[model samples]
Target: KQAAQSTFNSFHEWAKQAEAMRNPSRMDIYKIYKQDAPHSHPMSDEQQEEFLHTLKALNGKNGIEVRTQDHDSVRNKKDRNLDKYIAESPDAKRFFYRIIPKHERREDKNQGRLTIGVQPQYATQLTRAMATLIGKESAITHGKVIGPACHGQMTDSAVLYINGDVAKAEKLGEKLKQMSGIPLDAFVEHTPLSMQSLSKGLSYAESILGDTRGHGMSRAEVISDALRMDGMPFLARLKLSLSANGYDPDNPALRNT
Candidate 1:
């Protein structure tokens, strides 16, 4: 018990330092967008043009540039094949845009997985509501909502995964939070903890020219990822274990495994 408690305290101390390592101005919007995609909406050509203009006005104020994957300036193509492209690729449905932070103009490669962090108190409700409401969007890929189940009791820091389709995930996650009585702020978005891809070397996949276009994260990553999360992993596990079993269970093998 003492060992577990001490380890838990150690994690908090690390979190404090990790939090300090980050500066708000140094945040990479491109990196952040990997996990939290820009909002998407279905719009007609005219609507898209108008939206771009509005974005230009807003981005101009903030000195942020709206761009495409190639870092090509987002301007209407002089020789636009707007109708032809849509006609050729029938599945290309919605228009998407990204907001890249201005300071980090040089781009490199990094990627992320989108996951939702739910507090222990509201975990079950959010998970249940997600199962019920997530069926509405087929484009949204969701993973199992898992928290550490210590000694048969769910612990703190329950996580819900949204593999891709950030805009859709945000809508559905927001709805789930609202319906489950979880606060709006409960919908959390996480990006890579490191600096921009330009500074940090590229991952193996990107280095070899791999098809870096999917969004699902393996279960192993989920387990590893949850470790960096706040809310005290070991303490939460210990708290639940003790609450359910009271020091220990009848079977030694079954006690707090």
Candidate 2:
């Protein structure tokens, strides 16, 4: 808890400094962290931006505030409490910040938040397989998604998360649906984007790939199974589908750079 809180503290500190610094962002902090700590190479600006956004989210510092003609709750945007946020728009028509709320269907009783979820329907035992896969594969791309676990009320159902941008999630969801295969059945539904809706997206690698899922890791022959069942794309996907140990539809050479 100490170490985790300390990491979150650093994220919070970084946000304050970034917001104060003209045009600074989580991406800038990412550069500093890499430059001072450990890394094999510098992250691209895009990667850095993504890292910071995820950090801002997981650190529990993601929030919004309202600034009107007389009131300046401008500081609230940096606060990171979706449930605590409240305000009428400065004007009636222009509401800008994203205020997502908690969803009710978690594996446990009422574990929900203002984040994206990528839910999937799968064959028997596929949930565990996919969860383990996502938990391992998406360790780096954190805030962009939630689970391969069932919603509290729904069993054998796999839900993945993304940013809560449902209004714009269709095109992306359609694309992610296009990437489904083996482990993924079909991302057949486009749930609307509400604070109560779906997800957000932030990873960028143009390495387009297919819907086939590969499981198990070993020095010996790995377990690559056939698609016992199929489901559509649940999340209009890019970040997760774009690379698997770095596979690109566009990059034939398979180079990271």
Candidate 3:
């Protein structure tokens, strides 16, 4: 089982990297599409052209470029097919293009407050665990315990917001190793923390990553990518774990996850 799991993990990692390479600009396009067309289905050739034109017009004021993945491109072909399918089906088209205004859309305003910082060595595992735990907790606690009522409230918030210096986090990591009997790194290097404000939270992330080699991307890039990349690695891992653990999709218990 251990060997099989390792093989599976390796294959998935490769698959993810391949996907990323195939669509380096996917994150950017996806970000815009999700924001602008949250409910819209794929567009037909005619609708696609119209949508692109409309998007360009809407974003002209903001100086944003509105380019969709090309229909002929390998990476964009799937989206094109989806658009074509939706065009042929009126019911699907209605379902897809149920656009709500930006202000009216269900946006994660609280995400601006959420900060996550992780050490390099443990970055992968910590992120994976956090993703899983947050997703599970969000669903379970959404309306029942942690919605608008507990939006900013701190219930076991300590776990959510890891508070400590590098040394302190290192010590905690050691404790985790002892408790879990996991032979992970003991260095102060790989710790994860989160905060409420985007600025402060991301600042901390940059500072920590700066200490590491080749890990420091620009603050603007990180923040922008976070906003743009909807199914980020950490978030995706969290969702995957939750689904694997038998989370009910239809009757989601809460909104947090």
Among these predictions, the greatest lDDT belongs to 1
Which consecutive 10 residues in model 2 have the weakest lDDT in total? 218-227
- lDDT for each of the candidates? 0.31, 0.25, 0.27
Cα RMSD for predicted model 1? 19.4
lDDT tens per residue, model 3, 151-232 = 1121111122232333333343333334432233321221111111122112111123112121111211232333344555
Q: Score candidate 1 by TM-score against the native.
A: 0.28
| Model 1 ranges with Cα > 4 A deviation | 1-113, 147-164, 184-257
Instruction: Determine which window of 10 residues in candidate 3 has minimal summed lDDT.
Output: 140-149
Best first by lDDT, ranked: 1, 3, 2
Error of 1 at 176 (Å): 2.4
